[PDB]
Design a binder for these strands. Structure first.
Lengths: 104, 80, 93, 96, 93, 104, 96, 80
DNA sequence: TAATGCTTGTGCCTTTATTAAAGAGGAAAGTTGCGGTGGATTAAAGCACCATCGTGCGGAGAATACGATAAGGCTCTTGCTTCATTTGAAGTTATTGACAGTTGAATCGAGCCGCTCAATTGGTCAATTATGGAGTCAATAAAGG
DNA sequence: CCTTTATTGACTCCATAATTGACCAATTGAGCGGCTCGATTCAACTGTCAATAACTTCAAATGAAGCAAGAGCCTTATCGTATTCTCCGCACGATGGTGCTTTAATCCACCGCAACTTTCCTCTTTAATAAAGGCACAAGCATTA
């Protein structure tokens, strides 16, 4: 028995995502490669966000990712900020910015 | 319960403005900011309570608040 | 009752990207919520695409079009490239 | 005596509170306010603590974003002091 | 292919409200689109409500809660009153 | 054979709305009164919008409703304007408004 | 000779164009613009005429709403002349 | 096709501003208004074309434009 | 510039608690086989979108005279900031009790599924009436005196 | 206020096209029966939320005093506006051509269903080290001279 994630070369649960897609009743039938495609996309997005968050944590001289680092990674990236513009991160704070007029 | 809107003190509003990048604050802001805040809560809590009323429950859960926020384009991570 | 979360797989992904960096429980919950939200967005877009074209099944093509609709720009390009690679690897085996 | 000119400690507070991630509103007054507001929709309601925490974080995020928009409106009118009209204009453009 | 619209029933409703006032074809299409959009909104909200509570069926209670969530204020109150009246009339017969 | 719409005292097609609800697969099963509630709500909304539009048409001394009258009815009502705030009416124009500062 | 003061014919045009429901952009130049823009996404695209009409009406509605927001921002700064900075502020607050 | 953005003439932008309640228009607005408009179209047409590409068609229909607009919170009645 | 208060950044001890590691089980994924329903292929009608041509006329482009609006400078006066003192209320800890959410079972109600069919609704064609095009007049308002 | 002039709305006559009415079929809603599931009620367990009390000490309230920022006023110069002439390409009408969209038949292929296995992922428990708390401390900055 070779798991579908190992067959597709992924770390994400292709089988669990298949179960979630079937349970959600998004369509009458589900294609063979739709869960594989979804798992690949989710894995890529998680990898991107975690790469940016780990870089932010390293820049702060910390070895652990906290919600602040996730928010910094999200807000400092153009495309992730576009994707998650209307999203509030708990315990994330805000991006440090002060208008030029307010400076002395 | 009455007058609890005044529990949102002037220093709290000033701290929220500081986190928002505000340097100087007018005197009448603290009143306006209160009313605005109240409106926001009334838009969310209502929806939340609606969910609580549909599940035949009497206790408002974090799921109800999260769904009520998502209904208004204010998705909130960390409580899911 | 056992609760389904991605907290396992996300951790695996982290150890593939930053082997020496851990993640907190609050950050893990935020990442899990992010994955769930993106999953729902993509699945709903795929359902809408299938319904618009009178198609009863969701294939990898519906998922690809949903990824193009939902993710912006280079994010969508790279996600489509990874999904196509994974589907090719899955089919070839 | 040593006194700072106006706007210096304000800038320091801007830098300090934009770096922290803590909640800025006191928890108990906000909990009382939420219970007051909910008592008009359904009497004898119970609130799970995490529900009130989620409400507080959402409200604080909303107010901080609104204050950023208000500061932009104030700068547009060649000012540094935010005024109620700035909040009203920001909420009008936002669609509220 | 026969195209299915509400243009009949809406017209009936108009003759109940303004017997002496007609409606144009463009306004007919706009009203039909409005009815379709509101139907889709309420149905999707009912589906979300059923999914959140792990319920397999959509009852009139799900529709009532969806009406409360979607329509604002007095609109929601009057719509709930009309729906309850219709359900009572349908059941009593 | 008594039609369900007549049984519920409605003008809208309870049966067609039932078929639309079942075709959309919004849930595995559909209750008996859910299409009736749907039809009642849709009928009430149509009646409200048509009442306001007909009043607008009468005020303009016209006996026919055009998209302009629909837009005027929608934007002159608080509840309908809130419900349809992010909606564009084709051939509808805008509500006539001029800021008091611009007037002489 | 009879000369109207500035801003009078402007007010008359405001009243005239707010009452009409016609399209304000010429159809053929807009059709050419839409085809130009779409040629960068997929070469050899055909456009159904009603698709271009829907695009034109959506674009005109968007621009009219944006100009209402821009006028609000201009009046905020104690002006009657809308400026590019007003459009920029309106789009920034709108989330664009 | 080139230079077609210049087909959105200054009088057309002026009429659109008049419908928006604008009394006075700066000289450089007509340029900015063009660029803004372009961005808007690029956000819609793209999405529309995507739908056209999924249905395996070569002709963009009014349904594609309506769906692309609804995807962005710009629901448009009258073409459904 | 420069001396000096001053707040914030930096280095180290402590602990702790928040995350890393491990186990039993049980819930869920992989496998196998069948068969039917859905996607892919091909051909054809017809229709619908692109390109052409003509024209003629209303709208766009450019120049002109100009007034009035935006921008800069000045002044002032009041409203908001910074700081110090007093207090009073939020925060934390430990405890109680009772309400309400969750899980488990029976069961009676209710909605899915098949098939018939007939009653309602949509495509197609004729048509009249509300509305537009155009001309003319009466009321309204703006601009100079 | 007055008087002239430009603009717009009402009023009517004629065209016109656009909505209303009527008919044939088509297709789908209503009815009836059988059956399995689900949601309603009941009950117990159990999680946790509201309320209590106490103490503390840190943040909120209030006032003084100071200063600098917003607002009103004045001046200017330049730049958007109203008007006119001219020009030019948009739009409407008619027509050809073709390609591409929809429909229907056909075949194959692939995915849902059902049951068995087997394995991996999730509560529960234990550990350990990254980081906050606290103390000491250096330094870049602001402030007045």
């Amino acid at each position: 028995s070779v798991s579908k994630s190992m067959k597709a070369g992924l770390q994400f649960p292709v089988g669990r995502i298949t179960r979630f897609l079937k349970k959600g009743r998004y369509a009458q039938r589900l294609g063979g490669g739709a869960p594989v495609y979804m798992a690949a996309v989710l894995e890529y997005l998680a990898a991107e966000v975690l790469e940016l968050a780990g870089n932010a944590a390293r820049d702060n001289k910390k070895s652990r990712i906290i919600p602040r680092h996730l928010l910094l990674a999200i807000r400092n990236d153009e495309e992730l900020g576009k994707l998650l513009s209307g999203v509030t991160i708990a315990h994330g704070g805000v991006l440090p910015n002060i208008n030029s007029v307010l400076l002395p | 319960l009455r007058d609890n809107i005044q529990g949102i003190t002037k220093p709290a509003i000033r701290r929220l403005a500081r986190r928002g990048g505000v340097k100087r604050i007018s005197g009448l802001i603290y009143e306006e900011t209160r009313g605005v805040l109240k409106i926001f809560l009334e838009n969310v809590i209502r929806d939340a309570v609606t969910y609580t009323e549909h599940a035949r429950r009497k206790t408002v859960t974090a799921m109800d608040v999260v769904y009520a926020l998502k209904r208004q384009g204010r998705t909130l991570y960390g409580f899911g | 009752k056992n609760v389904e979360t991605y907290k396992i797989y996300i951790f695996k992904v982290l150890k593939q990207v930053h082997p020496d960096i851990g993640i907190s429980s609050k950050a893990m919950g935020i990442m899990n919520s992010f994955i769930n939200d993106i999953f729902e967005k993509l699945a709903q877009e795929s359902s809408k695409l299938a319904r618009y074209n009178k198609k009863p099944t969701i294939t990898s093509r519906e998922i690809q079009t949903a990824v193009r609709l939902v993710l912006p720009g280079e994010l969508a390009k790279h996600a489509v490239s990874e999904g196509t690679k994974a589907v090719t690897k899955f089919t070839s085996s | 005596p040593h006194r700072y000119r106006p706007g210096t400690v304000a800038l320091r507070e801007i830098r300090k509170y934009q770096k922290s991630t803590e909640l800025l509103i006191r928890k108990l007054p906000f909990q009382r306010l939420v219970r007051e507001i909910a008592q008009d929709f359904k009497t004898d309601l119970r609130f799970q603590s995490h529900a009130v925490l989620a409400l507080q974080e959402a409200a604080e995020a909303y107010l901080v974003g609104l204050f950023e928009d208000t500061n932009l409106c104030a700068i547009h009118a060649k000012r540094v002091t935010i005024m109620p009209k700035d909040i009203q204009l920001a909420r009008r453009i936002r669609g509220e």
